[PDB]
Every structure is written in C-alpha cells, then in structure tokens.
Amino acid sequence: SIRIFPRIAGRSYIIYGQTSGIICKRMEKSDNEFVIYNYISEHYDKFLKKYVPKLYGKNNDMLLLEDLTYNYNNPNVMDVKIGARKRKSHTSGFFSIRGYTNSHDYKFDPDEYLTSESTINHIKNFMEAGGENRDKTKQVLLKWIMKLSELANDLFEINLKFDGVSLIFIYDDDCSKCDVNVVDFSRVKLIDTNDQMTISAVTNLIKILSELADNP
C-alpha cells in the first residue's frame, strides 16, 4: 500500500503515511525544506506552532507532516502561492491561486493571469461547495481573516524570505470548521529584514476576504 495523496497543486511526490493523520512529502531537489523547518523551530517556535503543519520527523528524503485535511469530513482546499515565484510574476498581482477543490468545474487555469474581478470570482467559486448558508460562509471567512491578520502582523518580525510558500485554505462542506496554514519551505531563505512581498500577498488576501465577508 502506497496511497497517493490527493494534492491540490505542485509536482512533489506526496503519499499517505502508513499511519493516520500523516502525509509523507519527498524532498526532491535538496533538504532545504527540512533545514528551514528546523531553523524556524529553533528561532521562531511561536510562528511554527500557530501557522505551520507539524513536522513529526524525517525518513531518508521523506518529511512526515501533519495532514491538514485529516480532521475534515468533506474538506475543500485552496492553495494560494504567497511567496515569490521562481521566475514568473504572480497570476493575481500579489499572489497566485495554484488550485482549489472543484476548480475544473469553473475552468480554472493556473497559468491564466487574472483581473481583480476574476481573482475574486475564483475565491467565490472555491466557497460555493460551502453552500447557501451565507452566515456559515461569513464565519469561515472571518476565521480566516482572524488568522491571516495575526500572520501578517507576526511576519513583520521574521527575517526570512518566504520564496515559494503557499497558504492552504480548508473548510468542511458543512462550514462547521476551517483553517489556513503556511506550507512548502523548500525555497525559503535567511535574510536580514522581513519579507514585504509576502506581507503584501497576505494583506491583499485580507482585503479581498474582508470585502467578501461584508458584501450584502
């Protein structure tokens, strides 16, 4: 039993752990992701505890990570790239939606450059599986805004360049719970200042979600 993990985006080999609640991500190019998890653990442990899946350990080239979808009956997942891309500019200006649950139904294309209006529409598309209870969808948005606000505030004090990192947004079909966490440290770098570009990605998301939560 190798059970392939249903990824939203990326090209790394990710499988289910042999045990419950764990996924195994192969470090394809270097062990930098492991070096960065260990650096954050030693220098910014509060950031790791609040915003990042637990790293349970390492097996050869495999990271044993907390499965962020594990406690969900019917998870809907959106992957938003908020760190700098390797060569390309962001598809939505400050960030790039990499994919989401049911995106094929909406003709989402991760290579398409989007206007603000199309960006907002794809986020609304992601929220449609959450259903007709406007009040429950508002609560999911507000809980994301609560955590992302705190993240953006905390990023001012972190001397890392979060190149390539993604936000994984999750809500259950019934909107009974949600979360957002930072994943993919494989290109993160030590620097002597905060990462303003990544902070701008997060504040732009906060603005967009806040408009959605307030829309009548």
Ligand X SMILES: Nc1ncnc2c1ncn2[C@@H]1O[C@H](COP(=O)(O)OP(=O)(O)OP(=O)(O)O)[C@@H](O)[C@H]1O
Per the annotation, where are the binding residues for 1D-myo-inositol hexakisphosphate? 29, 81, 85-88, 187
Distance CA 57, CA 63 (A): 6
Q: Is 66 in the site for ligand X (CB under 6 A)?
A: yes
Distance CA 215, CA 147 (A): 20
Distance CA 194, CA 157 (A): 6
Q: Is 103 in the site for ligand X (CB under 6 A)?
A: no
Residues forming a β-bridge with 167:
80, 182
Q: Could you tell me which residues are annotated as the binding site?
A: 8-9, 11-12, 25, 29, 66-68, 79, 81, 85-88, 184, 187
3-state secondary structure of 55: strand
- 14 or 114: whose CB is closer to ligand X? 14
Give the contacts of 35 (CB within 8 A, at least 6 positions apart).
none
Minimum separation from the CB atom of position 214 to ligand X (A): 28
Distance CA 179, CA 181 (A): 7
Q: Could you tell me which residues are annotated as the binding site for Mg(2+)?
A: 184
Q: Is 96 in the site for ligand X (CB under 6 A)?
A: no
98 in Cβ contact with 82 (< 8 Å): no
Choice from 36, 79, 96, 151 touching ligand X (CB under 6 A): 79
User: What is the contact mask toward ligand X in residues 24 to 43, using x (rule: CB under 6 A)?
Assistant: -x--x---------------
Choice from 76, 96, 186, 198 touching ligand X (CB under 6 A): 186
Q: What are phi and psi of 98, to 5 degrees?
A: -95, -25
Q: Is 11 in the site for ligand X (CB under 6 A)?
A: yes
What part of residues 112-171 is at the interface with ligand X (CB under 6 A)? Answer: 166, 168
Q: Which two tokens stand for residue 108?
A: 């989402």
Residues near ligand X (CB under 6 A) are 7-12, 14, 23, 25, 28, 53, 65-69, 77, 79, 166, 168, 183-184, 186
